[PDB]
Amino acid sequence: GQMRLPSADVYRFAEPDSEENIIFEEGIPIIKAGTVIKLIERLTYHMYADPNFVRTFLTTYRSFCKPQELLSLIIERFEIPEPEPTEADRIAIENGDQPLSAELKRFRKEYIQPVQLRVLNVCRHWVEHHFYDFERDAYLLQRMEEFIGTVRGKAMKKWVESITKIIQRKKIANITFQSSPPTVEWHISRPGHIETFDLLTLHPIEIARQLTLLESDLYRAVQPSELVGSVWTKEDKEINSPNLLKMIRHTTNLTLWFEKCIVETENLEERVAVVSRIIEILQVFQELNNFNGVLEVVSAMNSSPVYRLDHTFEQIPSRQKKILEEAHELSEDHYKKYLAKLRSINPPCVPFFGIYLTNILKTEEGNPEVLKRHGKELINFSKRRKVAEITGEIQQYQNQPYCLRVESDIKRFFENLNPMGNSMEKEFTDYLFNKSLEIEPRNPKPLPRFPKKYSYPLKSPGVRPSNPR
Amino acid sequence: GMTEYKLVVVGAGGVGKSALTIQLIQNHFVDEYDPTIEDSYRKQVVIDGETCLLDILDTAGQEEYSAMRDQYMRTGEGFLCVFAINNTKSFEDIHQYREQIKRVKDSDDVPMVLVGNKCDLAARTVESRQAQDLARSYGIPYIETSAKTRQGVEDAFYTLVREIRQH
């Protein structure tokens, strides 16, 4: 038979399941909705572990339970009463013999020890992967340190001593590869001559590599805390989502730099060379699976100032027209081909973040926080699972590092890029559009001629890498 | 077969813009949504007795990718320009959204509707007369919608389709 449980009057987590406190989806069960008590029971269930659920719960719980209250509830879960001696134990003791304590021993082995270890696993995941709760509430951290540091008894001792050390390390807080990274490539600009760095003077291969390292680092720095609750759209977004916003602002700046390089090149022949070079950078982005970089280029080519430059795009080689067209097709039909390509490639990659943001926001906005059943309000956990499926996908692509060498001067050049200068956005984008009208006027105005601005060769070195001994 | 209309929702972030399309496309009568599902943004409808397919692009949440707006806007035949009735700044943004649409589409007469969205119970700061006057100055319809009761949602999209049909 099943183990008997403590009275629900002394231990709240022994109340029987009912549709008034938990609802399952239609081989471990998947929870659609429940009370916070039932969610925590299943988070730390004696019959099975549910590591996905631990991640889902710790990522999303603040929408229905405060951090201080979560800690109180898992401490309450941990403190399980032991059953009294049975009739057979009583009779043995009355005869001066040692009781077998069979029911007590089974309850310890199959209920107390698994539940307690799974509570500690929640604590361990909380500290290791969601430490921001403790960075933002020093008293919460004190309570966690006190709880862990006062767990007695030898069955939990190894993990209690370990979690104590992990907490202390997190308070005061290296890559190996299958091969060597390829050699850094140089074109007109030579190493150390940062004053000459520009779109056409750096090697297009190395532009794409260094932007990919930068954009990968920005992608990898975004934590779920910047996403749950749609906080990057709210009034405190600069406080709550700074790494996400830094990543987006880099993408915007690079797109605008591409547009500025194009329309400020007034000579037609030179401007064709500029556009052709940007499409070569896009080709290397594709080879590197840097989809953020691919769409940075596509966004620039589709911008109002650039899209209308028919005289320029007429002279682009056919093979480059095809590269740009197949990159543009990734975004068509609501990113259908992009989504399929992302799910097919071999990482490392840099995803485009915008789709994730829209899906998290619409999942939050389109589903209710609670479900009303039998007069009770149950937490709608299915909504939180959907959000955590998205944050889990994001995290999966954050793991794999690029095997490319940093070039510190090229990295600094792109970190310091500032195409808008001190201008406001409307000012600047109106300037770009007026430049477009200057260099290729609306029909029937005649096409003017403009002097060259570059004194160095415009011929591209190409995007196939070289390898000296 | 039936005509497909490519509609684009534009407007300030953080003020409930996404509720318009969610409420339209939703199981009208079950409050639930999975935006990741293929064709959670396509809906077959009958407008004035003529069946058509709406394909709605709503990039809510991507407002900070400001250099992508041109690309997203060029996909559209008609536009819903959305502001929140309790956020004056989102109303003041409308002029620049309209100017950007006209530039991207290279036309002074692009099908569009102005939508004032009530996204919570916070106090209204844009009166309906202010929004009606703005819409009239542009020559476009004005529709007010609730983000909670679905009121006005069908009217906003159907009015835009009629603007496309009568262009």
Next chain:
Amino acid sequence: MTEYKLVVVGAGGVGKSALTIQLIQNHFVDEYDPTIEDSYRKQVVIDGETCLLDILDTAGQEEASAMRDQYMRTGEGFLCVFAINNTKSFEDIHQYREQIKRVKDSDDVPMVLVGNKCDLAARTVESRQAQDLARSYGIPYIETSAKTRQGVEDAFYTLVREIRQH
């Protein structure tokens, strides 16, 4: 994308977590933080086919030994890890092998025998003894180092191939 459920089992301290984190993050963990249960995901192209690996990293400490049936039921394939400088961990392998066979009620479960810490000179389990055991199970034997990456991809991706051909 086909999804594969891999489970990493073996005695405490043999390097199950270090192997998994090396595969997932290309990083070697120096600390010895005993695992309760952790799970990882990895998209990777293997033999030209994209798949999604779900990797369950399990507890080796004996205090968790009564909690294994629940994860053995869900796993498709098992990495059975010992450390080549720890003869007791090698003797513990057969207990994991027999429990997996009981739980899954099968003599034919995808498995790979892994001898970890092969960067260390002071070996106490000879390759031949481990290879003999592997042959008796019908499974391959791969020596690995979570520290240097030697053999790490080979161990995990060989297990994927076993599940695929099962």
